[PDB]
Symmetry: C3
Subunit: 207 residues, 3 copies
Amino acid sequence: TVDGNSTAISNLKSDISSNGLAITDLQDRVKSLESTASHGLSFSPPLSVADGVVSLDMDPYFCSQRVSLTSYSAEAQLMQFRWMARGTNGSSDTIDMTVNAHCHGRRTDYMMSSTGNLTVTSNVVLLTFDLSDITHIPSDLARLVPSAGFQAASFPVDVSFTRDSATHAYQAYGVYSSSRVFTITFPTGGDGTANIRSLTVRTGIDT
Amino acid sequence: TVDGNSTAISNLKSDISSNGLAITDLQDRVKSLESTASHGLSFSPPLSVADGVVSLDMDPYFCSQRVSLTSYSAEAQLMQFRWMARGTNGSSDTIDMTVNAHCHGRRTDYMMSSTGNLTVTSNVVLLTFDLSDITHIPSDLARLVPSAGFQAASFPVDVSFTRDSATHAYQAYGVYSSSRVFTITFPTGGDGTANIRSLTVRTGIDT
Amino acid sequence: TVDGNSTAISNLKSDISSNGLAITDLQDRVKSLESTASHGLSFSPPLSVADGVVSLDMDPYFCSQRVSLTSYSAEAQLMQFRWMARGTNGSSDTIDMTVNAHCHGRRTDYMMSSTGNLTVTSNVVLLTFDLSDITHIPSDLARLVPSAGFQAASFPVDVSFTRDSATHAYQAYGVYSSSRVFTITFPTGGDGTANIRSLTVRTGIDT
Ligand SMILES: [Cl-]
Ligand SMILES: [Cl-]
Ligand SMILES: [Zn+2]
Ligand SMILES: [Zn+2]
Ligand SMILES: [Zn+2]
Ligand SMILES: [Zn+2]
Ligand SMILES: [Zn+2]
Ligand SMILES: [Zn+2]
Ligand SMILES: [Zn+2]
Protein backbone atom coordinates (compact mmCIF):
# COMPACT_ATOMS: atom_id res chain seq x y z
CA THR A 1 0.00 0.00 0.00
CA VAL A 2 2.91 2.36 0.65
CA ASP A 3 4.34 0.80 -2.50
CA GLY A 4 0.93 1.06 -4.29
CA ASN A 5 0.59 4.75 -3.33
CA SER A 6 4.14 5.35 -4.54
CA THR A 7 3.32 3.81 -7.91
CA ALA A 8 0.14 5.98 -8.13
CA ILE A 9 2.26 9.06 -7.27
CA SER A 10 4.76 8.23 -10.05
CA ASN A 11 1.84 7.94 -12.52
CA LEU A 12 0.41 11.32 -11.41
CA LYS A 13 3.84 12.93 -11.76
CA SER A 14 4.02 11.68 -15.35
CA ASP A 15 0.55 13.14 -16.13
CA ILE A 16 1.39 16.45 -14.47
CA SER A 17 4.56 16.60 -16.61
CA SER A 18 2.56 15.96 -19.84
CA ASN A 19 0.08 18.68 -18.87
CA GLY A 20 3.06 20.99 -18.22
CA LEU A 21 4.45 20.40 -21.72
CA ALA A 22 1.04 20.81 -23.34
CA ILE A 23 0.79 24.19 -21.53
CA THR A 24 4.24 25.31 -22.73
CA ASP A 25 3.23 24.43 -26.33
CA LEU A 26 -0.03 26.40 -25.90
CA GLN A 27 1.90 29.34 -24.45
CA ASP A 28 4.20 29.53 -27.52
CA ARG A 29 1.27 29.05 -29.95
CA VAL A 30 -0.72 31.81 -28.19
CA LYS A 31 2.37 34.09 -28.34
CA SER A 32 2.35 33.89 -32.17
CA LEU A 33 -1.38 34.59 -32.42
CA GLU A 34 -1.03 37.61 -30.10
CA SER A 35 1.50 39.23 -32.45
CA THR A 36 -0.10 38.34 -35.86
CA ALA A 37 0.34 41.35 -38.23
CA SER A 38 -3.30 41.38 -39.50
CA HIS A 39 -4.50 42.20 -35.93
CA GLY A 40 -5.05 45.98 -35.62
CA LEU A 41 -5.19 46.73 -39.35
CA SER A 42 -6.70 50.19 -39.87
CA PHE A 43 -8.04 51.96 -42.95
CA SER A 44 -7.32 55.55 -43.96
CA PRO A 45 -9.75 57.66 -46.14
CA PRO A 46 -11.20 57.09 -48.77
CA LEU A 47 -11.23 53.56 -47.22
CA SER A 48 -13.41 53.06 -44.15
CA VAL A 49 -14.76 50.39 -41.75
CA ALA A 50 -18.25 50.11 -40.25
CA ASP A 51 -19.41 47.00 -38.35
CA GLY A 52 -16.55 44.91 -39.78
CA VAL A 53 -17.27 45.94 -43.42
CA VAL A 54 -14.45 47.70 -45.30
CA SER A 55 -15.79 50.12 -47.95
CA LEU A 56 -14.40 52.49 -50.55
CA ASP A 57 -16.17 55.78 -49.92
CA MET A 58 -17.12 57.23 -53.38
CA ASP A 59 -18.04 60.82 -54.40
CA PRO A 60 -21.02 60.05 -56.64
CA TYR A 61 -20.11 63.12 -58.79
CA PHE A 62 -16.85 61.39 -59.69
CA CYS A 63 -17.17 57.60 -59.33
CA SER A 64 -19.48 54.72 -58.44
CA GLN A 65 -19.36 50.91 -58.45
CA ARG A 66 -20.90 48.44 -60.83
CA VAL A 67 -18.84 45.65 -59.29
CA SER A 68 -15.75 47.57 -60.47
CA LEU A 69 -14.89 51.20 -59.72
CA THR A 70 -16.32 53.24 -62.62
CA SER A 71 -17.46 56.84 -63.38
CA TYR A 72 -20.08 59.09 -61.83
CA SER A 73 -23.56 58.03 -60.80
CA ALA A 74 -24.95 61.50 -59.96
CA GLU A 75 -27.55 62.89 -62.31
CA ALA A 76 -26.37 65.45 -64.85
CA GLN A 77 -28.11 68.81 -64.73
CA LEU A 78 -28.71 71.56 -67.28
CA MET A 79 -29.13 74.72 -65.19
CA GLN A 80 -30.57 77.93 -66.68
CA PHE A 81 -30.17 81.25 -64.88
CA ARG A 82 -29.32 84.90 -65.40
CA TRP A 83 -25.90 86.15 -64.40
CA MET A 84 -25.19 89.86 -64.25
CA ALA A 85 -21.55 90.31 -65.36
CA ARG A 86 -19.49 93.35 -64.30
CA GLY A 87 -17.02 95.37 -66.36
CA THR A 88 -13.97 95.67 -64.03
CA ASN A 89 -11.38 97.27 -66.34
CA GLY A 90 -11.93 98.92 -69.75
CA SER A 91 -15.66 99.22 -68.77
CA SER A 92 -17.64 100.38 -65.72
CA ASP A 93 -20.86 98.88 -67.13
CA THR A 94 -22.78 95.66 -66.40
CA ILE A 95 -24.49 93.15 -68.70
CA ASP A 96 -27.09 90.42 -68.13
CA MET A 97 -26.05 86.98 -69.39
CA THR A 98 -28.50 84.14 -69.97
CA VAL A 99 -26.52 81.10 -68.82
CA ASN A 100 -26.93 77.39 -69.51
CA ALA A 101 -24.60 75.41 -67.28
CA HIS A 102 -24.35 71.76 -68.27
CA CYS A 103 -23.15 69.86 -65.21
CA HIS A 104 -22.04 66.33 -65.97
CA GLY A 105 -20.01 64.57 -63.26
CA ARG A 106 -17.52 67.16 -61.97
CA ARG A 107 -17.39 69.06 -65.27
CA THR A 108 -19.51 72.21 -65.63
CA ASP A 109 -19.74 73.65 -69.16
CA TYR A 110 -21.07 77.18 -69.56
CA MET A 111 -22.96 78.49 -72.59
CA MET A 112 -23.85 82.20 -72.11
CA SER A 113 -25.49 84.83 -74.28
CA SER A 114 -26.11 88.48 -73.40
CA THR A 115 -29.13 90.65 -73.41
CA GLY A 116 -28.31 94.32 -73.94
CA ASN A 117 -25.22 96.32 -74.72
CA LEU A 118 -21.99 96.61 -72.78
CA THR A 119 -20.27 100.01 -72.88
CA VAL A 120 -16.47 99.65 -73.26
CA THR A 121 -13.83 102.46 -73.15
CA SER A 122 -10.66 100.67 -74.23
CA ASN A 123 -9.37 98.05 -76.67
CA VAL A 124 -9.47 95.25 -74.04
CA VAL A 125 -12.12 94.60 -71.37
CA LEU A 126 -12.25 92.56 -68.17
CA LEU A 127 -15.63 91.06 -67.41
CA THR A 128 -16.22 89.60 -63.98
CA PHE A 129 -18.49 86.72 -63.01
CA ASP A 130 -19.24 86.67 -59.26
CA LEU A 131 -21.60 83.97 -57.90
CA SER A 132 -23.38 86.73 -55.87
CA ASP A 133 -24.60 88.34 -59.10
CA ILE A 134 -26.54 85.27 -60.20
CA THR A 135 -30.28 85.72 -60.16
CA HIS A 136 -32.13 82.75 -58.66
CA ILE A 137 -29.06 80.92 -57.43
CA PRO A 138 -29.42 77.18 -58.23
CA SER A 139 -29.65 74.55 -55.43
CA ASP A 140 -26.45 72.73 -56.43
CA LEU A 141 -24.31 75.88 -56.28
CA ALA A 142 -21.32 73.59 -55.72
CA ARG A 143 -21.59 72.85 -59.50
CA LEU A 144 -20.41 76.45 -60.16
CA VAL A 145 -17.35 76.44 -57.91
CA PRO A 146 -14.07 75.30 -59.52
CA SER A 147 -11.88 72.80 -57.63
CA ALA A 148 -8.72 74.09 -55.92
CA GLY A 149 -6.66 72.34 -58.57
CA PHE A 150 -8.59 74.01 -61.48
CA GLN A 151 -8.37 77.48 -59.88
CA ALA A 152 -4.56 77.44 -59.94
CA ALA A 153 -4.44 78.38 -63.67
CA SER A 154 -6.05 80.52 -66.37
CA PHE A 155 -8.43 78.59 -68.59
CA PRO A 156 -9.63 79.02 -72.23
CA VAL A 157 -12.84 80.96 -72.94
CA ASP A 158 -14.48 81.55 -76.36
CA VAL A 159 -15.96 85.02 -76.73
CA SER A 160 -17.90 86.64 -79.57
CA PHE A 161 -19.89 89.84 -79.95
CA THR A 162 -20.98 92.47 -82.42
CA ARG A 163 -19.76 96.06 -82.56
CA ASP A 164 -20.80 98.64 -85.22
CA SER A 165 -22.60 95.98 -87.33
CA ALA A 166 -19.55 93.64 -87.46
CA THR A 167 -18.94 90.33 -85.66
CA HIS A 168 -15.79 89.77 -83.58
CA ALA A 169 -14.67 86.39 -82.09
CA TYR A 170 -11.60 85.59 -79.96
CA GLN A 171 -10.09 82.65 -78.12
CA ALA A 172 -9.56 84.36 -74.68
CA TYR A 173 -8.84 83.37 -71.07
CA GLY A 174 -10.42 83.53 -67.68
CA VAL A 175 -8.94 83.23 -64.21
CA TYR A 176 -10.52 82.76 -60.75
CA SER A 177 -9.48 85.45 -58.23
CA SER A 178 -11.29 83.46 -55.53
CA SER A 179 -13.57 80.39 -55.44
CA ARG A 180 -16.68 82.47 -56.25
CA VAL A 181 -15.36 84.96 -58.84
CA PHE A 182 -13.71 84.66 -62.26
CA THR A 183 -12.78 87.33 -64.72
CA ILE A 184 -12.40 86.98 -68.49
CA THR A 185 -10.18 89.34 -70.54
CA PHE A 186 -10.87 89.92 -74.23
CA PRO A 187 -10.31 92.46 -76.99
CA THR A 188 -13.24 94.80 -77.74
CA GLY A 189 -12.67 95.06 -81.52
CA GLY A 190 -11.63 98.71 -81.53
CA ASP A 191 -10.71 101.70 -79.37
CA GLY A 192 -12.51 104.42 -77.47
CA THR A 193 -16.05 104.44 -76.18
CA ALA A 194 -18.32 101.97 -77.92
CA ASN A 195 -21.03 99.41 -77.28
CA ILE A 196 -20.77 95.70 -77.85
CA ARG A 197 -23.88 93.46 -78.19
CA SER A 198 -24.74 89.79 -78.65
CA LEU A 199 -21.96 88.73 -76.31
CA THR A 200 -21.57 85.00 -76.13
CA VAL A 201 -19.24 83.19 -73.76
CA ARG A 202 -18.31 79.49 -73.87
CA THR A 203 -16.00 77.91 -71.35
CA GLY A 204 -15.91 75.01 -68.84
CA ILE A 205 -14.62 74.29 -65.35
CA ASP A 206 -13.64 71.29 -63.22
CA THR A 207 -15.48 71.33 -59.89
CA THR B 1 7.68 6.20 3.54
CA VAL B 2 4.19 7.35 4.52
CA ASP B 3 5.94 10.62 5.32
CA GLY B 4 7.97 10.45 2.04
CA ASN B 5 4.79 9.81 -0.01
CA SER B 6 3.10 12.71 1.78
CA THR B 7 5.96 15.03 0.85
CA ALA B 8 5.76 13.81 -2.80
CA ILE B 9 1.97 14.44 -2.74
CA SER B 10 2.50 18.02 -1.46
CA ASN B 11 4.98 18.62 -4.31
CA LEU B 12 2.52 17.27 -6.91
CA LYS B 13 -0.25 19.47 -5.48
CA SER B 14 1.99 22.51 -5.93
CA ASP B 15 2.70 21.55 -9.60
CA ILE B 16 -0.97 20.88 -10.29
CA SER B 17 -1.78 24.34 -8.86
CA SER B 18 0.84 26.03 -11.13
CA ASN B 19 -0.56 24.20 -14.16
CA GLY B 20 -4.05 25.38 -13.09
CA LEU B 21 -2.93 29.03 -13.02
CA ALA B 22 -1.09 28.72 -16.33
CA ILE B 23 -4.37 27.36 -17.82
CA THR B 24 -6.43 30.26 -16.40
CA ASP B 25 -3.95 32.74 -17.93
CA LEU B 26 -4.19 30.91 -21.29
CA GLN B 27 -7.98 30.93 -21.07
CA ASP B 28 -8.08 34.74 -20.63
CA ARG B 29 -5.45 35.29 -23.37
CA VAL B 30 -7.40 33.03 -25.78
CA LYS B 31 -10.62 34.95 -24.90
CA SER B 32 -9.05 38.20 -26.20
CA LEU B 33 -7.80 36.59 -29.42
CA GLU B 34 -11.25 35.08 -30.06
CA SER B 35 -12.86 38.53 -30.03
CA THR B 36 -10.17 40.55 -31.92
CA ALA B 37 -11.94 43.09 -34.22
CA SER B 38 -9.82 42.33 -37.34
CA HIS B 39 -11.23 38.74 -37.39
CA GLY B 40 -14.15 38.57 -39.87
CA LEU B 41 -13.32 41.77 -41.77
CA SER B 42 -15.23 41.77 -45.07
CA PHE B 43 -14.91 43.90 -48.20
CA SER B 44 -17.78 45.48 -50.14
CA PRO B 45 -17.57 46.31 -53.92
CA PRO B 46 -15.48 47.77 -55.61
CA LEU B 47 -13.18 46.09 -53.02
CA SER B 48 -12.89 42.31 -53.19
CA VAL B 49 -10.98 39.31 -51.73
CA ALA B 50 -9.69 36.23 -53.57
CA ASP B 51 -7.34 33.71 -51.90
CA GLY B 52 -6.45 36.19 -49.13
CA VAL B 53 -5.61 39.04 -51.58
CA VAL B 54 -7.66 42.25 -51.25
CA SER B 55 -8.03 44.07 -54.60
CA LEU B 56 -9.63 47.23 -55.91
CA ASP B 57 -11.70 46.11 -58.88
CA MET B 58 -11.17 48.73 -61.68
CA ASP B 59 -13.27 49.48 -64.81
CA PRO B 60 -10.46 49.81 -67.35
CA TYR B 61 -12.58 52.42 -69.25
CA PHE B 62 -12.36 54.67 -66.21
CA CYS B 63 -9.28 53.83 -64.11
CA SER B 64 -6.21 51.62 -63.79
CA GLN B 65 -3.18 51.32 -61.49
CA ARG B 66 0.40 52.34 -62.05
CA VAL B 67 1.14 51.80 -58.37
CA SER B 68 -1.41 54.56 -57.66
CA LEU B 69 -5.01 54.71 -58.87
CA THR B 70 -4.94 56.66 -62.16
CA SER B 71 -7.05 57.08 -65.35
CA TYR B 72 -8.23 54.65 -68.00
CA SER B 73 -6.14 51.89 -69.55
CA ALA B 74 -8.61 50.80 -72.26
CA GLU B 75 -7.67 51.63 -75.82
CA ALA B 76 -9.36 54.65 -77.37
CA GLN B 77 -11.31 53.98 -80.55
CA LEU B 78 -12.32 56.12 -83.51
CA MET B 79 -15.45 54.43 -84.89
CA GLN B 80 -16.84 55.28 -88.35
CA PHE B 81 -20.36 54.26 -89.33
CA ARG B 82 -23.50 55.49 -91.02
CA TRP B 83 -26.47 56.49 -88.90
CA MET B 84 -29.85 57.09 -90.48
CA ALA B 85 -31.49 59.92 -88.50
CA ARG B 86 -35.28 60.36 -88.39
CA GLY B 87 -37.31 63.57 -88.51
CA THR B 88 -39.81 63.15 -85.62
CA ASN B 89 -41.46 66.60 -85.50
CA GLY B 90 -41.29 69.39 -88.11
CA SER B 91 -40.17 66.69 -90.64
CA SER B 92 -41.30 63.19 -91.64
CA ASP B 93 -38.09 62.61 -93.63
CA THR B 94 -34.87 60.71 -92.88
CA ILE B 95 -31.21 61.56 -93.51
CA ASP B 96 -28.00 59.49 -93.61
CA MET B 97 -25.25 60.77 -91.31
CA THR B 98 -21.61 59.75 -91.66
CA VAL B 99 -20.49 59.48 -88.03
CA ASN B 100 -17.04 59.50 -86.43
CA ALA B 101 -17.33 58.58 -82.77
CA HIS B 102 -14.15 59.21 -80.82
CA CYS B 103 -14.27 57.01 -77.73
CA HIS B 104 -11.66 57.88 -75.15
CA GLY B 105 -12.16 56.43 -71.66
CA ARG B 106 -15.88 56.84 -70.88
CA ARG B 107 -16.27 59.91 -73.10
CA THR B 108 -17.70 59.45 -76.60
CA ASP B 109 -17.47 62.49 -78.89
CA TYR B 110 -19.56 62.50 -82.06
CA MET B 111 -18.65 64.26 -85.31
CA MET B 112 -21.41 63.75 -87.92
CA SER B 113 -21.98 65.03 -91.44
CA SER B 114 -24.97 64.32 -93.69
CA THR B 115 -25.32 63.00 -97.16
CA GLY B 116 -28.47 64.23 -98.89
CA ASN B 117 -31.23 66.66 -98.08
CA LEU B 118 -33.67 66.66 -95.19
CA THR B 119 -37.18 67.95 -95.96
CA VAL B 120 -38.50 70.17 -93.12
CA THR B 121 -42.03 71.68 -92.80
CA SER B 122 -41.66 74.05 -89.84
CA ASN B 123 -39.24 76.54 -88.28
CA VAL B 124 -37.90 73.96 -85.76
CA VAL B 125 -37.12 70.28 -86.33
CA LEU B 126 -36.58 67.27 -84.08
CA LEU B 127 -34.08 64.76 -85.38
CA THR B 128 -33.89 61.38 -83.71
CA PHE B 129 -30.85 59.12 -83.33
CA ASP B 130 -31.84 55.53 -82.48
CA LEU B 131 -29.07 52.90 -82.13
CA SER B 132 -31.21 50.53 -84.28
CA ASP B 133 -30.77 52.82 -87.28
CA ILE B 134 -26.99 52.49 -87.31
CA THR B 135 -25.64 50.60 -90.28
CA HIS B 136 -22.94 48.09 -89.35
CA ILE B 137 -23.32 48.42 -85.61
CA PRO B 138 -19.84 48.56 -83.99
CA SER B 139 -18.63 45.80 -81.60
CA ASP B 140 -18.27 48.10 -78.58
CA LEU B 141 -21.87 49.36 -78.81
CA ALA B 142 -21.60 50.17 -75.09
CA ARG B 143 -19.50 53.21 -76.24
CA LEU B 144 -22.72 54.71 -77.72
CA VAL B 145 -24.94 54.34 -74.66
CA PRO B 146 -24.94 57.28 -72.21
CA SER B 147 -24.63 56.53 -68.47
CA ALA B 148 -27.75 56.79 -66.30
CA GLY B 149 -26.32 59.94 -64.75
CA PHE B 150 -25.72 61.61 -68.18
CA GLN B 151 -29.21 60.69 -69.45
CA ALA B 152 -30.92 62.67 -66.69
CA ALA B 153 -30.37 66.01 -68.51
CA SER B 154 -30.37 67.72 -71.91
CA PHE B 155 -26.90 68.22 -73.33
CA PRO B 156 -25.37 70.77 -75.78
CA VAL B 157 -25.19 69.94 -79.51
CA ASP B 158 -23.67 72.09 -82.29
CA VAL B 159 -25.64 71.99 -85.52
CA SER B 160 -25.02 73.58 -88.91
CA PHE B 161 -26.55 73.21 -92.36
CA THR B 162 -27.27 75.03 -95.58
CA ARG B 163 -30.68 76.11 -96.83
CA ASP B 164 -31.31 78.11 -100.06
CA SER B 165 -27.57 78.76 -100.59
CA ALA B 166 -27.03 80.19 -97.06
CA THR B 167 -25.30 78.63 -94.04
CA HIS B 168 -27.06 78.40 -90.66
CA ALA B 169 -25.40 77.36 -87.34
CA TYR B 170 -26.95 77.02 -83.86
CA GLN B 171 -25.94 75.93 -80.38
CA ALA B 172 -28.81 73.42 -79.73
CA TYR B 173 -29.67 70.60 -77.32
CA GLY B 174 -30.31 66.91 -77.32
CA VAL B 175 -32.02 64.66 -74.80
CA TYR B 176 -32.17 60.85 -74.41
CA SER B 177 -35.74 59.47 -74.29
CA SER B 178 -34.28 56.05 -73.47
CA SER B 179 -30.78 54.53 -73.30
CA ARG B 180 -30.73 53.84 -77.08
CA VAL B 181 -32.41 56.97 -78.50
CA PHE B 182 -31.68 60.70 -78.39
CA THR B 183 -33.37 63.54 -80.16
CA ILE B 184 -31.88 66.93 -81.05
CA THR B 185 -34.06 70.04 -81.56
CA PHE B 186 -32.87 72.90 -83.75
CA PRO B 187 -34.18 75.79 -85.83
CA THR B 188 -34.44 75.18 -89.59
CA GLY B 189 -33.53 78.72 -90.71
CA GLY B 190 -36.96 79.61 -92.08
CA ASP B 191 -40.59 78.52 -92.36
CA GLY B 192 -42.65 76.24 -94.55
CA THR B 193 -41.50 73.35 -96.67
CA ALA B 194 -37.82 73.44 -97.52
CA ASN B 195 -34.73 71.27 -97.77
CA ILE B 196 -31.65 71.53 -95.63
CA ARG B 197 -28.28 70.03 -96.72
CA SER B 198 -24.74 69.64 -95.37
CA LEU B 199 -26.03 68.94 -91.89
CA THR B 200 -23.26 68.63 -89.37
CA VAL B 201 -23.74 67.60 -85.76
CA ARG B 202 -21.13 67.81 -82.98
CA THR B 203 -21.84 66.68 -79.46
CA GLY B 204 -20.46 64.30 -76.79
CA ILE B 205 -21.75 61.89 -74.15
CA ASP B 206 -20.55 60.27 -70.91
CA THR B 207 -20.95 56.50 -71.06
CA THR C 1 -2.17 7.67 6.82
CA VAL C 2 -1.84 5.17 3.97
CA ASP C 3 -5.58 5.69 3.63
CA GLY C 4 -5.19 9.51 4.00
CA ASN C 5 -2.45 9.59 1.32
CA SER C 6 -4.67 7.48 -0.94
CA THR C 7 -7.53 9.94 -0.55
CA ALA C 8 -5.12 12.85 -1.33
CA ILE C 9 -3.90 10.94 -4.42
CA SER C 10 -7.50 10.46 -5.64
CA ASN C 11 -8.09 14.21 -5.23
CA LEU C 12 -4.91 15.06 -7.19
CA LYS C 13 -5.94 12.64 -9.96
CA SER C 14 -9.27 14.46 -10.26
CA ASP C 15 -7.48 17.86 -10.53
CA ILE C 16 -4.99 16.53 -13.07
CA SER C 17 -7.93 15.23 -15.13
CA SER C 18 -9.68 18.67 -15.04
CA ASN C 19 -6.45 20.37 -16.10
CA GLY C 20 -6.18 17.80 -18.94
CA LEU C 21 -9.67 18.66 -20.21
CA ALA C 22 -9.06 22.39 -19.91
CA ILE C 23 -5.91 21.87 -22.05
CA THR C 24 -7.81 19.89 -24.71
CA ASP C 25 -10.40 22.71 -24.91
CA LEU C 26 -7.59 25.28 -25.25
CA GLN C 27 -5.94 23.17 -27.94
CA ASP C 28 -9.13 23.11 -30.06
CA ARG C 29 -9.79 26.84 -29.47
CA VAL C 30 -6.19 27.70 -30.46
CA LYS C 31 -6.57 25.50 -33.60
CA SER C 32 -9.45 27.72 -34.82
CA LEU C 33 -7.54 30.95 -34.15
CA GLU C 34 -4.49 29.61 -36.01
CA SER C 35 -6.55 29.09 -39.18
CA THR C 36 -8.74 32.28 -39.09
CA ALA C 37 -9.13 33.59 -42.69
CA SER C 38 -8.36 37.27 -41.85
CA HIS C 39 -4.79 36.24 -40.81
CA GLY C 40 -2.39 36.87 -43.74
CA LEU C 41 -4.67 39.23 -45.69
CA SER C 42 -2.59 41.08 -48.29
CA PHE C 43 -3.31 44.13 -50.44
CA SER C 44 -2.55 44.48 -54.15
CA PRO C 45 -1.94 47.91 -55.86
CA PRO C 46 -3.48 50.55 -55.81
CA LEU C 47 -4.13 49.34 -52.21
CA SER C 48 -1.14 49.27 -49.87
CA VAL C 49 -0.13 48.71 -46.20
CA ALA C 50 2.43 50.63 -44.15
CA ASP C 51 2.78 50.16 -40.36
CA GLY C 52 -0.65 48.48 -40.14
CA VAL C 53 -2.44 51.28 -42.09
CA VAL C 54 -4.22 50.27 -45.32
CA SER C 55 -4.30 53.11 -47.87
CA LEU C 56 -5.63 53.73 -51.35
CA ASP C 57 -2.68 55.12 -53.30
CA MET C 58 -4.02 58.03 -55.45
CA ASP C 59 -2.51 59.71 -58.56
CA PRO C 60 -3.16 63.35 -57.64
CA TYR C 61 -3.59 64.16 -61.38
CA PHE C 62 -6.63 61.88 -61.42
CA CYS C 63 -8.14 61.57 -57.93
CA SER C 64 -7.88 62.64 -54.30
CA GLN C 65 -9.88 62.18 -51.08
CA ARG C 66 -12.16 64.57 -49.27
CA VAL C 67 -13.41 61.74 -47.08
CA SER C 68 -14.71 60.11 -50.28
CA LEU C 69 -12.73 59.33 -53.42
CA THR C 70 -13.13 62.37 -55.71
CA SER C 71 -11.34 64.08 -58.65
CA TYR C 72 -7.86 65.51 -59.06
CA SER C 73 -6.04 67.63 -56.51
CA ALA C 74 -3.02 68.60 -58.66
CA GLU C 75 -2.82 72.20 -59.76
CA ALA C 76 -3.92 72.96 -63.31
CA GLN C 77 -1.31 74.62 -65.51
CA LEU C 78 -1.50 76.85 -68.57
CA MET C 79 1.82 76.29 -70.36
CA GLN C 80 3.03 78.62 -73.13
CA PHE C 81 5.84 77.58 -75.46
CA ARG C 82 6.92 77.55 -79.08
CA TRP C 83 6.71 74.32 -81.04
CA MET C 84 8.37 74.02 -84.42
CA ALA C 85 6.11 71.76 -86.54
CA ARG C 86 7.47 69.78 -89.51
CA GLY C 87 5.86 69.17 -92.89
CA THR C 88 6.29 65.38 -93.41
CA ASN C 89 4.22 64.78 -96.57
CA GLY C 90 2.85 67.37 -99.03
CA SER C 91 5.43 69.84 -97.56
CA SER C 92 9.15 69.78 -96.72
CA ASP C 93 8.86 73.06 -94.77
CA THR C 94 8.63 73.87 -91.05
CA ILE C 95 6.49 76.35 -89.12
CA ASP C 96 6.71 77.86 -85.62
CA MET C 97 3.57 77.42 -83.52
CA THR C 98 2.83 79.47 -80.41
CA VAL C 99 1.21 76.90 -78.11
CA ASN C 100 -0.99 77.28 -75.03
CA ALA C 101 -1.44 73.91 -73.37
CA HIS C 102 -4.13 73.93 -70.71
CA CYS C 103 -3.42 71.00 -68.39
CA HIS C 104 -6.28 70.20 -66.05
CA GLY C 105 -6.14 66.82 -64.30
CA ARG C 106 -5.05 64.30 -66.95
CA ARG C 107 -6.54 66.30 -69.83
CA THR C 108 -4.22 68.53 -71.88
CA ASP C 109 -5.95 70.90 -74.32
CA TYR C 110 -3.83 72.55 -77.01
CA MET C 111 -4.50 75.97 -78.55
CA MET C 112 -1.85 76.75 -81.22
CA SER C 113 -1.34 79.60 -83.67
CA SER C 114 1.44 79.94 -86.25
CA THR C 115 3.93 82.60 -87.01
CA GLY C 116 5.03 82.60 -90.64
CA ASN C 117 4.04 80.75 -93.77
CA LEU C 118 4.11 77.03 -94.48
CA THR C 119 4.97 76.03 -98.06
CA VAL C 120 2.75 73.15 -99.28
CA THR C 121 3.04 71.22 -102.61
CA SER C 122 -0.12 69.11 -102.63
CA ASN C 123 -3.82 69.24 -101.75
CA VAL C 124 -3.28 67.51 -98.35
CA VAL C 125 -0.45 68.05 -95.85
CA LEU C 126 0.91 66.10 -92.89
CA LEU C 127 2.26 68.24 -90.09
CA THR C 128 4.29 66.58 -87.38
CA PHE C 129 4.58 67.58 -83.72
CA ASP C 130 7.63 66.00 -82.04
CA LEU C 131 8.34 66.86 -78.37
CA SER C 132 12.03 67.38 -79.34
CA ASP C 133 11.07 70.40 -81.44
CA ILE C 134 9.61 72.31 -78.51
CA THR C 135 11.59 75.36 -77.52
CA HIS C 136 12.03 75.69 -73.76
CA ILE C 137 10.58 72.32 -72.86
CA PRO C 138 8.27 72.72 -69.82
CA SER C 139 9.07 71.02 -66.46
CA ASP C 140 5.94 68.84 -66.43
CA LEU C 141 6.66 67.33 -69.86
CA ALA C 142 4.53 64.36 -68.78
CA ARG C 143 1.52 66.71 -69.44
CA LEU C 144 2.33 66.48 -73.19
CA VAL C 145 2.54 62.70 -73.48
CA PRO C 146 -0.73 60.88 -74.28
CA SER C 147 -1.63 57.77 -72.25
CA ALA C 148 -1.19 54.35 -73.88
CA GLY C 149 -4.96 54.05 -74.10
CA PHE C 150 -5.34 57.46 -75.89
CA GLN C 151 -2.51 56.69 -78.36
CA ALA C 152 -4.34 53.64 -79.74
CA ALA C 153 -6.63 55.80 -81.95
CA SER C 154 -6.76 58.88 -84.18
CA PHE C 155 -8.26 61.91 -82.47
CA PRO C 156 -10.13 65.03 -83.74
CA VAL C 157 -8.18 68.22 -84.49
CA ASP C 158 -9.60 71.59 -85.65
CA VAL C 159 -7.44 73.34 -88.21
CA SER C 160 -7.77 76.71 -89.92
CA PHE C 161 -5.51 78.85 -92.08
CA THR C 162 -5.47 81.42 -94.84
CA ARG C 163 -4.31 80.86 -98.40
CA ASP C 164 -4.45 83.50 -101.21
CA SER C 165 -6.51 85.92 -99.05
CA ALA C 166 -9.20 83.31 -98.20
CA THR C 167 -9.85 81.44 -94.93
CA HIS C 168 -10.08 77.64 -94.84
CA ALA C 169 -11.23 75.54 -91.82
CA TYR C 170 -11.50 71.75 -91.47
CA GLN C 171 -12.36 69.17 -88.83
CA ALA C 172 -9.23 66.91 -89.23
CA TYR C 173 -7.44 64.14 -87.33
CA GLY C 174 -4.17 63.46 -85.65
CA VAL C 175 -2.47 60.22 -84.66
CA TYR C 176 0.53 59.44 -82.42
CA SER C 177 3.25 57.40 -84.17
CA SER C 178 5.04 57.10 -80.82
CA SER C 179 4.59 58.59 -77.33
CA ARG C 180 6.50 61.78 -78.27
CA VAL C 181 5.27 62.45 -81.83
CA PHE C 182 1.87 63.08 -83.43
CA THR C 183 1.01 64.01 -86.96
CA ILE C 184 -2.09 65.86 -88.17
CA THR C 185 -3.41 65.49 -91.75
CA PHE C 186 -5.48 68.25 -93.35
CA PRO C 187 -6.45 69.65 -96.74
CA THR C 188 -4.46 72.67 -97.94
CA GLY C 189 -7.33 74.43 -99.76
CA GLY C 190 -5.97 73.95 -103.27
CA ASP C 191 -3.31 72.24 -105.37
CA GLY C 192 0.29 72.85 -106.34
CA THR C 193 2.87 74.96 -104.60
CA ALA C 194 1.40 77.57 -102.29
CA ASN C 195 1.82 79.15 -98.88
CA ILE C 196 -0.60 78.90 -96.00
CA ARG C 197 -0.54 81.40 -93.08
CA SER C 198 -2.35 82.01 -89.79
CA LEU C 199 -2.46 78.30 -89.04
CA THR C 200 -4.41 77.52 -85.93
CA VAL C 201 -4.68 74.09 -84.36
CA ARG C 202 -7.07 73.05 -81.57
CA THR C 203 -7.11 69.57 -80.14
CA GLY C 204 -6.80 67.75 -76.77
CA ILE C 205 -5.21 64.61 -75.35
CA ASP C 206 -5.64 62.29 -72.35
CA THR C 207 -2.36 61.85 -70.51
CL1 LIG D 1 1.35 6.11 1.63
CL1 LIG E 1 -1.85 19.10 -14.01
ZN1 LIG F 1 7.82 -1.07 -5.43
ZN1 LIG G 1 -6.00 36.53 -35.10
ZN1 LIG H 1 -25.29 99.30 -68.99
ZN1 LIG I 1 6.92 14.72 7.86
ZN1 LIG J 1 -35.70 62.00 -97.77
ZN1 LIG K 1 -10.28 4.40 2.89
ZN1 LIG L 1 9.76 77.76 -94.19
